[PDB]
Amino acid sequence: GDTLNDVIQDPTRRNKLINDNNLLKGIIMGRDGPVPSS
Amino acid sequence: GDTLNDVIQDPTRRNKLINDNNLLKGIIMGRDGPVPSS
Fold this sequence. Notes:
part of a larger assembly; 2 chains; alpha+beta; two-stranded antiparallel sheet; 2 strands
């Protein structure tokens, strides 16, 4: 029964969560709609 | 048949219980409703 705490305490899992969710990247509000920035 | 006593006597399980339930964190009473503080 792992939670976000177990993910955050592990650098590999924390960075996987950060990367897979684009948490370091802003969002481009284009006229066609929002898209994550690369 | 473990109880809260077995959880509390073990530092790992006690801290898992504390962390997974935000027991050290207050609650923000916003106009949209209560939310746990980070």
